[PDB]
Amino acid sequence: MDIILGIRVQDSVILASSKAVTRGISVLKDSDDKTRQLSPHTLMSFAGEAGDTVQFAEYIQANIQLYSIREDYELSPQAVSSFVRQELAKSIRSRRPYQVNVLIGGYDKKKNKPELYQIDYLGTKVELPYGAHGYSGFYTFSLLDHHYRPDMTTEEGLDLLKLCVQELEKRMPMDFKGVIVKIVDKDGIRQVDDF
Amino acid sequence: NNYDGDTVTFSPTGRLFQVEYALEAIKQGSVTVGLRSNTHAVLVALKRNADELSSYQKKIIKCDEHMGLSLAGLAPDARVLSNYLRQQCNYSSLVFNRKLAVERAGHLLCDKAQKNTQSYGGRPYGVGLLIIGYDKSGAHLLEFQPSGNVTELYGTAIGARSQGAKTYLERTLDTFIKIDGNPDELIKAGVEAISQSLRDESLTVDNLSIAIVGKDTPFTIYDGEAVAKYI
């Protein structure tokens, strides 16, 4: 775990997440997918304490999937993000809290708008045009402040994202073994295989 | 009649019918005998089968190296009560490094059976037990009834047609009590005692069940070819 990014553009949400899994002085894996599909038009990336991350992500995934079957209906990204926030807000005052930070990218089919939510382990939610967790933000936010425009296309968003990964690969201390990029739009979720 | 629905109800003459119906289950059970001298204490038990293809229901259970019992009635209830005795004997050993007195064993069984006869929902135990043992005051024989009543005796018998063996032991009292330092003769007396309760059936090799405990003898059970000596 370490690097997770998110960019909301005109018609889609793009999530980029690092591939490395490191323990001690060894990179155990360089092809790790730090994300789970919560619903056909909602994707959640995650980063934080070992074990907690996947356990939390899959627990949320199970609950949203349960809701979908029960109501035969897909929850809005806003509704999913609120559910996730409340779970983390409960967690922080538990005996052992989930130390997990997430980004939730979704496409609201009723509004026909992409939506990106950033939620930290305390349960702090914010809707944003672009977001990041951990040390990544210290480089990417200022970069996006400059280059980001609200009316960009998905292709323009991917180039903007390439610019962020290049900067991180230049100035970050650790080798995070590149990123897996996924796009969320009106047609659902798909993965970019060549990045 | 109207006062036998549960154990919590007294009859107008002051009887507990559910306790009496539990007592009836013992009378249907197969006969078992208990007797003792000053040195040893013996249990003899007639085992019962379902048919010729089945095994013979085991009647005797070991509780400790120095104590055990024979059963008559509901066998599962005997398993519950014997397991409780095993724990109590074991508590006395681990905590006090002390072999549980046979008299205390009776007091504990009495009190356990009693609680089941004064509360709603529960039921009385449906089994009678003969507890033998050798402790710091010599050999002992006890008779347990699920009413709660426990009685120390020289000899006794419970089960179907138990009156025959109980009469014999009442006649033989003066003889068998002085069989000291002789296990085989005390068993012979017990085997002859249970024989007074037999009808149409005789004691065979996989039918008879004997158990003994004494001064220099741990509680041991004899079945199969090991009881052929006493037929």
């Binding site: - | 036998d4 629905g5 549960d6 559910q18 119906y21 539990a22 007592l23 009836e24 289950a25 013992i26 009378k27 249907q28 089968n49 379902a50 048919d51 010729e52 293809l53 089945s54 095994s55 229901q57 009635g73 509901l74 066998a75 599962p76 398993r79 929902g121 529960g122 039921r123 009385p124 449906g126």
Partner: protein, 235 residues
């Protein structure tokens, strides 16, 4: 009404005696023990021809060395099997060994009387528990809802039990081979069954020291049915 754990004037528990009547309504199950193995066979008894008979599971594995057949309210047996499997595996975890067939049966029978006012009523199903161990060899047990179990050389339970038991009394001897026992279960099942016996409405199984507990295929049983018919016509 009246208490669940009430004694009758004859000294029997009403609910236990009534559960025994439910078991008499159940489909027939037979078990025979030999020195070469133990055979377990059951009547499937499909209620309708549209019902896929292979989904009727009345013979069941508890461990590699212990098998089980049932008769009566078969839904009640699920938690008994679940307990038996856990008991068997748990003992292997605690002692690094197979568990004795008798000890397994005793553990199952401890559930029996755990009812009252614990569960609300006794089990309405009887079990035949077959197995092998190093100490007492090949064994067959009959476990009732009374909490009692008997070892048997041969035993039948269910609706055609008293008729089948009388037949087993004559046919069983201490030198029976496994093949002889297989045919004998089929023979006695065909006698007491309502519908005509075939591979689809009856099922065989066995437990041997070498190969463990095995449920036979419909192809294997069909040949044993054909072998049985030929031998009866041969004299």
């Amino acid at each position: 009404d009246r208490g669940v754990s009430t004694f009758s004037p004859e000294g029997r528990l009403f609910q236990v005696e009534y559960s025994l009547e439910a078991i008499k309504l159940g489909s027939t199950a037979i078990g025979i023990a030999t020195k070469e193995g133990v055979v377990l066979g059951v009547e499937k008894r499909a209620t309708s021809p549209l019902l896929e008979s292979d989904s009727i599971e009345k013979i069941v594995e508890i461990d590699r060395h212990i098998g089980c057949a049932m008769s009566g309210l078969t839904a009640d047996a699920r938690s008994m099997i679940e307990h038996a499997r856990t008991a068997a595996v748990t003992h292997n975890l605690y002692y690094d060994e197979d568990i004795n067939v008798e000890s397994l049966t005793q553990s199952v029978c401890d559930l029996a009387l755990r009812f009252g006012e614990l569960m609300s009523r006794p089990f309405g199903v009887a079990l035949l528990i077959a197995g092998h161990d190093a100490d007492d060899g090949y064994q067959l047990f009959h476990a009732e809802p009374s909490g009692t179990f008997y070892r048997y050389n041969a035993k039948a339970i269910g609706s055609g039990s008293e008729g089948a038991q009388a037949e087993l009394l004559n046919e069983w001897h201490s030198s029976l081979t496994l093949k002889e026992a297989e045919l004998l279960v089929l023979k006695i099942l065909k006698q007491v069954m309502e519908e005509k016996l075939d591979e689809n409405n009856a099922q065989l199984s066995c437990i041997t020291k070498q190969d463990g507990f095995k449920i036979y295929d419909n192809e294997k049983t069909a040949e044993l049915i054909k072998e049985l018919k030929e031998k009866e016509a041969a004299e």
